[PDB]
């Protein structure tokens, strides 16, 4: 036996997140392509007037490249609570996790 | 007969011979596995239960080879559940963006990390050898 050498200078978000529903994963958004989802909602972009719109992607690759790059300052649209409560979007979110 | 020191040195020579034998066996088993399989030399994300690893066969030695995490061992993407699509997708991201830092079971991993991978459990090298 023995312990695998581990270089912790290299960051990996998966090290600490123990709840699998808290991890972002890319899923087919049946209506419009692919979205980045977790229990917190969808990764979002600025809406019409300082609001929040679901960020959509045309390929799983673009969604994955966005999801696992270090980009931060990203807003989250959560359809399960107000403001902007969409019951069907919330139900979809719950069904894909 | 021999002093405790001479017997200890005999055992380190024995470890060398055993590791060499194991590496050669696994090389030959790799050729036998890669006989009729395309994409054998191309990285694939493999589920080891607790983690994902992006691995392939080395083209020179036919030994298992993984995307490496820095200067340590293979990059093992920790799963938080039996089904973890996020960890698998991060492994795909590794294949796309981090595939030029690699590590190979055997003498390479021995030189680089001080163990060959084949005589410790659990370890991706040993787990493949049991398959």
Curated annotation (Swiss-Prot), chain A:
Protein localization: Virion membrane
Broad class of where this protein is predominantly found: virion
Subunit structure, as described in the record: Part of a stable entry-fusion complex (EFC) which is at least composed of proteins OPG143, OPG147, OPG155, OPG086, OPG094, OPG107, OPG104, and OPG099. Formation of the viral membrane is necessary for the assembly of the complex. Interacts directly with protein OPG107.
Post-translation changes: Contains two intramolecular disulfide bonds. They are created by the viral disulfide bond formation pathway, a poxvirus-specific pathway that operates on the cytoplasmic side of the MV membranes.
Lineage per the UniProt record: Viruses, Varidnaviria, Bamfordvirae, Nucleocytoviricota, Pokkesviricetes
Bilayer topology: Single-pass type III membrane protein
Residues of the full protein shown: 50 to 146 of 146
Gene giving rise to this polypeptide: OPG155
Domain of life: Viruses
Keywords: Disulfide bond, Fusion of virus membrane with host membrane, Late protein, Membrane, Phosphoprotein, Transmembrane, Transmembrane helix, Viral penetration into host cytoplasm, Virion, Virus entry into host cell
BP GO annotations: membrane fusion involved in viral entry into host cell; symbiont entry into host cell
Name by which UniProt lists this protein: Envelope protein OPG155
Virion surface side of membrane: 1-97
Reported function: Envelope protein required for virus entry into host cell and for cell-cell fusion (syncytium formation).
Family: Belongs to the orthopoxvirus OPG155 protein family.
CC terms in the record's Gene Ontology section: membrane; viral envelope; virion membrane
UniProtKB/Swiss-Prot annotation, chain B:
Posttranslational modification: Contains two intramolecular disulfide bonds. They are created by the viral disulfide bond formation pathway, a poxvirus-specific pathway that operates on the cytoplasmic side of the MV membranes.
Phylogenetic placement of the source organism: Viruses, Varidnaviria, Bamfordvirae, Nucleocytoviricota, Pokkesviricetes
Its biological purpose: Envelope protein part of the entry-fusion complex responsible for the virus membrane fusion with host cell membrane during virus entry. Also plays a role in cell-cell fusion (syncytium formation).
Virion surface side: 1-131
Membrane topology: Single-pass type III membrane protein
Domain of life the protein comes from: Viruses
Family: Belongs to the orthopoxvirus OPG107 family.
UniProt name for this protein: MPXVgp092
GO cellular component, one term: membrane
Keywords: Disulfide bond, Fusion of virus membrane with host membrane, Host endoplasmic reticulum, Host membrane, Late protein, Membrane, Signal-anchor, Transmembrane, Transmembrane helix, Viral penetration into host cytoplasm, Virion, Virus entry into host cell
GO terms under biological process: membrane fusion involved in viral entry into host cell; symbiont entry into host cell
Subcellular location field: Virion membrane; Host endoplasmic reticulum membrane
Residue span relative to the full protein: 58 to 188 of 189
Subunit structure: Part of a stable entry-fusion complex (EFC) which is at least composed of proteins OPG143, OPG147, OPG155, OPG86, OPG94, OPG107, OPG104, and OPG099. Formation of the viral membrane is necessary for the assembly of the complex.
């Amino acid at each position: 036996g023995g312990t695998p050498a581990l270089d912790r200078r290299v960051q990996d978000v998966n090290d600490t997140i123990s709840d699998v529903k808290q991890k972002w994963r890319c899923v087919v958004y049946p209506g419009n392509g692919f979205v980045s989802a977790s229990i917190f909602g969808f990764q979002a972009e600025v809406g019409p007037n300082n609001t929040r719109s679901i960020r959509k992607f045309n390929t799983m690759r673009q969604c994955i490249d966005f999801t696992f790059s270090d980009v931060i300052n990203i807003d989250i649209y959560n359809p399960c609570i107000a403001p902007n409560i969409n019951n069907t979007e919330c139900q979809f979110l719950k069904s894909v996790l | 007969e021999l002093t405790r020191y001479m017997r200890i040195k005999n055992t380190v020579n024995d470890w060398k011979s055993l590791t060499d034998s194991k590496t050669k066996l696994e090389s030959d088993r790799g050729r036998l596995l890669a006989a009729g399989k395309d994409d054998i030399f191309e990285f694939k994300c493999v589920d080891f239960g607790a983690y994902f690893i992006a691995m392939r066969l080395d083209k020179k030695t036919y030994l298992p080879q993984a995307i490496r995490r820095g200067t340590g061992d293979a990059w093992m993407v920790k799963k938080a559940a039996k089904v973890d699509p996020s960890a698998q997708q991060f492994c795909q991201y590794l294949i796309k963006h981090k595939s030029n830092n690699v590590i190979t079971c055997g003498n390479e991993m021995l030189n680089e990390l001080g163990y060959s991978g084949y005589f410790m459990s659990p370890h991706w090298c040993s787990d493949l050898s049991n398959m």
